[PDB]
Subunit: 330 residues, 4 copies
């Protein structure tokens, strides 16, 4: 799987960049808990069903995706490889997986979107509502299909790895969308009224926040502790997903991320009730280790592992994988 | 117990063969979980009962067995020792334990069955229904007493040990029954209508699959994650057994396997409600380390450990061992 | 506490004797679980009560004891020190703690009892009922106050340490009461009708066995997996004690043993509802390391630790310690 | 965070003093459990609330504090640094955090209180009720705002580190308030009738003790196992807090301590329902490593971490942090 890639990335990247990537907030309690949560989940597979036409495809936000997965927004991809966002966006397009353009992309969102595929745009709320809504309109004018409003960063968590490294953006990595402020529910309304694209709230962990996101007109949420990078001691998304799925009752798409490292982890997420996962760090290890061709290989291996895991679980379709039962281990 | 044998086998076998044997799918989460599940189970022994006539015998599929245990189907036994299946089948016969002939046996099922004893036949479903049913008829014509239909291998799991070893069958190990396709419930019907032998579905983990197996006319099931070799993250059988036993309500025999390493583990399986266990890897460690006499010694040591464990638990009979209570530890 | 003593004993004893002492059955799952069970138990202390007259004394089987504790029966004490049972019995008497004379004592039970104090006698059932009942009468004629009928040894568990050591009784260690058979409930009746002493069944783990022991006229039970020396995978006593206490409802004394290593462990046992503990291995480490004076020092340190733990928990009396609540940790 | 400081303190202090500070009673089961309890607690953060005016302030015992935190009473602060209590009290005052003057302060309580700020006084009950009540009156005459009656030390726990070190007060460290006896509920009444200051019972772990403390006229309790220094095997405070909070139903302030090492730990304590925490050992590591300026820096870092954690959890106020939900991990 992806475990060699992690090493290959540790080798090629300067320590302080691999730390920017790998790290969480505080004591990294939430970073590690993301993995322990997935490792505790056991799937109950079903046997003897028709697998003649096993398909990993889903429809999400009006469109077909090849797998129940999107590339998570990860800022400043030129930190990992000279072609940064463009290499990832190309591989994503060719794998039929959505790609989430960041607000802090090291290439302009217009350029990334011209790559084609299914680009989404991740929004950080700026101090000026008009700058925020102009970023939303640019993304929509540029053909982005969803606004992934990041709602768990009223400010960045305390990253002790980057504080200890005195890490700072190299001169040659820029925020290309530019020549910030806590978001609120009113900020969500402002975006929702400005766009006809689906608004996807990223970083929901409370059941009542899931519910309110539906009330608020979200088309989706991402059940996420931000890869353990925001509140240290935040519950993992994976530990809140089943509850959140039951409370939303079909009222928006429910994605999850944090620690997805395999196809089997995708199967577990789907059996908990997720519509799709986001994968972050692994796509940046592939990017670091081998640029566009590395990301394309990661996405093919993940595509094979999802298909393998589904069929061994008796699931012809992602919808069947959602109906699987689970059992929690120790 | 068997722990020396494991070492003795590691010594004598080429690394890549010991890996074929020892390995599971994916990250081996289900391989390890099989052991953690049994280690969590504590038996509540009963005291002061009559042990004058302690007997480990059971009746299963019309016939007496000496212990609540059969040899699991393990392909290509000539990988482990020159006499392969014949050495194991001889030791099994002389120990009064059923032996499961594989579809991928490295000696023909007719030869293995001529050894006598209580041979069962494990069926992999082939692409051609007529080849499948002809393998069933051969087994029945050859005096096999049960068809162990393996229902958890629509295709083989991803074995990272064998992928990393680029492992492949030596020239001198053949599939002797030959000069494959996902099974379904219709495949089960096809076998059930073709034979009067008991059909035993191997690889059931879902309660509703157990129930349906009874509905379908199975004479037995094996509650099994295939030794952690199929879906990585599949629940252990041992973790589903009690639920499955309660749902079947006596309607077929319920075997379990995965990680049985002692007589006490046999006692635990029986106290959870299993009719019998299958033992896989340990019979191949004995075979590797000492051929027929090694398997016979393993089966005598297991026979002594089962009898010891039963009497220390106050059980004169396997039926009394099924009535024991358990308590789950950490 | 006792942890230095363990080392001091490892130093002075031949490896194979320290193994006779330290060891359990099978994989020692039940030996280790005894410790993990006590370590999981947290006491909820009470504050601000009157401690003016804190007393560790109890009345058990008609008589006062200085602490809620007795010395467990441990065979062949001359293995650990030349004065063997006599050194332990002297220290026990002078500490006001009952001492359990073994059926396999390396000094005659008449000699051990002449030491005075509060000797109990542990009975193994022999093949001949008349030899058994004659051992009971000797103990009673010798002034023993209780018969501790060991009911968890229809035969000795498989001790892999002693099998691997080919351990056997030295020539100079004898069974002094001599110049065996599974006990049953009828054996219990036979003893109960032969003596007016309290009969204490040692090795009860099932709730229904506790209840039946009361029905049968037992004056006590010892909730015990025999220090993990009998069924490997037997639940720890400490894990069944609260349930057993509730089911007996005051109908006999309920002792527990296995892994008691401190006064705080005595407090935990009492807060679970035990009347008293037995301590085995620690009394033999003291004996090995320093003979009679070593056992007397162990008993004084345990006496101080029990008194300390009780007062820090707000308990003036052992009866108050039984009313404490507990909380189970991980 | 504080983890470097711990090392810096280990370096500068004599082993036997760092052990006086770091150590618990018995096997330190309760010392370690304090940390495992906090590490098991996950917060469920809320998103998208107004953080325009995030404030860490609370009102407690009539007065504003800058953070939900006080310095715990820790005896003989001149052990850690020449300025001992005065350095800590100065830093506490300037950080707007209450400081708890000990009965065994190595500077007189009148001197410590002249520093100003929000001094509380911790009371150990003496053999003579009149000495006890005269210490209470001195504290009140000296402008202390609360009496923190320590109710979990009828006598000091067995500190094996200090027994093994034969540790004893250096000649140059004195008990400055001087030129002891178990407290009871009558002792609590005696203090309550002698002072109009709030009486805060420190070392409550039982629900019924919490309730009785309210009945008794306490203004507060501290849910505390005394940093694992008193009963070894005492439940952690953090494990009883939620239950205690629910039982008090607003009837007194409920503080907690034991193992608070960060702002996130403060957030966890508050989400469990605590009014405020006490921090002990970390304030003495800062003191040892850098005297007054070290304590002031610790309090600024803790102040920043609390504010960070609150905002990442969507809490504008400590009252909002109390309403957060939690989820217990493994
Ligand atoms: C290096 C880096 C950068 C980001 C992010 C993650 C990493 C690892 N994230 C979090 C991801 O989208 C995301 O939830 C996953 O990382 C968590 O899952 P995973 O890596 O285990 O698969 C991001 N999530 C977002 O919504 N937006 C990002 O820009 C996003 O937030 C920022 C940022 O812009 O600087 C951070 O610095 C940070 O999150 O710590 N950027
Ligand atoms: C080397 C090897 C080979 C097999 C199998 C196991 C091993 C270890 N199994 C699984 C066993 O029957 C079985 O459930 C036990 O192995 C699991 O228990 P255990 O070894 O812990 O006691 C097999 N179970 C079957 O129903 N049929 C086999 O042929 C069986 O499946 C195949 C195969 O034919 O190639 C596999 O390669 C595989 O399972 O991974 N073969
Ligand atoms: C070396 C030795 C010997 C014995 C026993 C224990 C040890 C350690 N026991 C078990 C104890 O009475 C007892 O329950 C405790 O050992 C378990 O608690 P602990 O040592 O953790 O405090 C014994 N319990 C009994 O009722 N009778 C003994 O003679 C007793 O049983 C025999 C025997 O006679 O040979 C054993 O060999 C054995 O138990 O394994 N003898
Ligand atoms: C070195 C030392 C000394 C004390 C105390 C703690 C330490 C570490 N305490 C316990 C604290 O107030 C307190 O609850 C915290 O230590 C527990 O939390 P933490 O250090 O993990 O943050 C104390 N709590 C009190 O109410 N009074 C103290 O004097 C207090 O009790 C005494 C004493 O006076 O000698 C002790 O020796 C002892 O507690 O073990 N003194």
């Amino acid at each position: 799987s992806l475990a060699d890639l992690e090493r290959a990335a540790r080798d090629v990247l300067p320590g302080e960049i691999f730390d920017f990537l790998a790290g969480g907030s505080g004591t990294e309690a939430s970073l590690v808990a993301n993995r322990t949560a997935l490792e505790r989940v056991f799937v109950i597979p079903r046997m003897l069903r028709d697998l003649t036409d096993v398909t990993t495809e889903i429809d999400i936000f009006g469109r077909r995706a090849a797998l129940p997965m999107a590339v998570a927004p990860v800022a400043y991809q030129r930190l990992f490889h000279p072609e940064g966002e463009l290499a990832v966006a190309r591989a994503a397009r060719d794998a039929g997986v959505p790609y989430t353009i960041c607000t802090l992309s090291s290439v302009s969102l217009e350029e990334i979107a011209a790559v084609g595929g299914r680009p989404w745009f991740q929004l950080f709320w700026l101090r000026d509502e008009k700058r925020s809504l102009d970023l939303v309109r640019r993304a929509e004018d540029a053909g982005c299909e969803a606004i992934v409003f990041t709602v768990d960063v009223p400010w960045m968590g305390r990253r002790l790895r980057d504080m200890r490294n005195g890490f700072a953006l190299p001169e040659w990595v820029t925020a290309a969308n530019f020549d910030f402020a806590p978001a609120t529910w009113e900020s969500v309304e402002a975006v929702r009224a400005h766009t006809d694209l689906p608004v996807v709230l990223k970083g929901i962990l409370a059941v009542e926040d899931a519910r309110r996101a539906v009330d608020a007109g979200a088309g989706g949420i991402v059940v996420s502790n931000h890869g353990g990078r925001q509140l240290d001691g935040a519950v993992p998304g994976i530990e809140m997903l089943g509850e959140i799925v039951a409370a939303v009752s079909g009222g928006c798409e429910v994605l999850v991320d944090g620690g997805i490292r395999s196809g089997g982890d995708v199967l577990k997420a789907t059996a908990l009730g997720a519509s799709a996962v986001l994968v972050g760090r692994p796509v940046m290890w592939a990017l670091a280790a081998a640029g566009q061709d590395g990301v394309r290989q990661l996405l093919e291996l993940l595509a094979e592992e999802v298909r393998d895991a589904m069929g061994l679980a008796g699931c012809e379709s992602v919808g069947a994988a959602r109906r699987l039962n689970t059992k929690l281990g120790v």
